[PDB]
Amino acid sequence: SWSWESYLEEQKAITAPVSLFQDSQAVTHNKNGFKLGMKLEGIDPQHPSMYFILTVAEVCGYRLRLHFDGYSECHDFWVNANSPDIHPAGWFEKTGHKLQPPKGYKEEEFSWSQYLRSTRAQAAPKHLFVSQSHSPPPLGFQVGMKLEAVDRMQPSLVCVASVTDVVDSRFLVHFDNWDDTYDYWCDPSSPYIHPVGWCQKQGKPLTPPQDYPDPDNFCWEKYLEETGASAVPTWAFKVRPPHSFLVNMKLEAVDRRNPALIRVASVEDVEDHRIKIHFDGWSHGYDFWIDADHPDIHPAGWCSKTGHPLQPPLG
């Protein structure tokens, strides 16, 4: 009953054109073959470097809710069917990764064939996954290389970092000697990474590894020699152009408080690479910043075309 067309007329508003989004945020014609109970492998959003056995706990449109086998439901999380952060059963074994076992197991004595028999479940068919490590790796980025990275939790901090994982065309950025809980996946065009030496050339403070001896006398050349690591080469960095979203443009965005819901939204403010989302009809107290390439923002009509409910403006 609620329609974008009517709403736009009503508000004398415009939608953010589909051209402003990445193809993966816009595609609506792909079918979601995931079914309840199917098992697979995937990264823990809270520990991006770790892989766990997951089960499809719910399906809604082109999205699915995943559950950490053996764990409580409050670890549950939602992803889109085209997420590059989930993989087919057996992926870890085939790509040299480590798989954390279900709470109640030793990865040491874990095998899919049998876990499946023991749970009388089916593994999600591999043709559904966009990432299976068949595609080309990011050019110039290899596990072990070092670089400088913005701690997206503390934007004022640019720190000494390392590439700790590489999957399909993305890599994992880790903050040297810090918790894996500040790590994040990204690609060569990320505006949050810079080559070794960037802070120095920019007159900005570089945060060295935690507890590095004599912190303010940190020398990259020295650190690279101590670790024998290479710096990601400068040619590998290809930062993306700033986005073209304009204030007042409307779109759809997953609700950050209740991930199951997606609401009608508007662009409240903008920066070169992030937009500030406002949920129509709600308090601006809920407005939040989000990267323009985040998988949870979509153009108007995404919910309708994918079969997902859309929450109309609060009234």
Swiss-Prot record:
Changing C159 to F/R: Strongly impairs binding to monomethylated and dimethylated peptides. Residues 175-182 are annotated as: Interaction with monomethylated and dimethylated peptides. It is found in: Nucleus. GO terms for cellular component: chromatin; chromatin lock complex; condensed chromosome; nucleoplasm; nucleus. The record marks D151 as: Mediates recognition of monomethylated and dimethylated peptides. Ubiquitinated in a VCP/p97-dependent way following DNA damage, leading to its removal from DNA damage sites, promoting accessibility of H4K20me2 mark for DNA repair protein TP53BP1, which is then recruited to DNA damage sites. MBT repeats lie at residues 2-102, 110-209, 218-313. Keywords: Chromatin regulator, Metal-binding, Nucleus, Phosphoprotein, Repeat, Repressor, Transcription, Transcription regulation, Ubl conjugation, Zinc, Zinc-finger. Changing F68A: Does not affect binding to monomethylated and dimethylated peptides. One of its GO terms (molecular function) is histone H4K20me2 reader activity. The record marks Q154 as: Positioned at the entrance of MBT 2 and is required for recognition of monomethylated and dimethylated peptides. GO terms for biological process: chromatin organization; constitutive heterochromatin formation; hemopoiesis; heterochromatin formation; negative regulation of DNA-templated transcription; regulation of cell cycle; regulation of megakaryocyte differentiation; regulation of mitotic nuclear division. Changing W178L: Abolishes binding to p53/TP53 monomethylated at 'Lys-382'. Widely expressed. Expression is reduced in colorectal cancer cell line SW480 and promyelocytic leukemia cell line HL-60. Homodimer. Interacts with RB1/RB (when monomethylated at 'Lys-860'). Interacts with p53/TP53 (when monomethylated at 'Lys-382'). Interacts with CBX3, ETV6, KMT5A and VCP/p97. The L3MBTL1 locus is imprinted. Paternal inherited gene is expressed, while the maternal inherited gene is silenced. The MBT repeat 2 specifically recognizes and binds monomethylated and dimethylated proteins. In contrast, it does not bind trimethylated proteins. The MBT repeat 1 does not bind methylated peptides but inserts a proline ring in a Pro-Ser-Ser/Thr sequence context. Polycomb group (PcG) protein that specifically recognizes and binds mono- and dimethyllysine residues on target proteins, thereby acting as a 'reader' of a network of post-translational modifications. PcG proteins maintain the transcriptionally repressive state of genes: acts as a chromatin compaction factor by recognizing and binding mono- and dimethylated histone H1b/H1-4 at 'Lys-26' (H1bK26me1 and H1bK26me2) and histone H4 at 'Lys-20' (H4K20me1 and H4K20me2), leading to condense chromatin and repress transcription. This is Lethal(3)malignant brain tumor-like protein 1. It comes from Homo sapiens. The lineage of its organism: Eukaryota, Metazoa, Chordata, Craniata, Vertebrata.
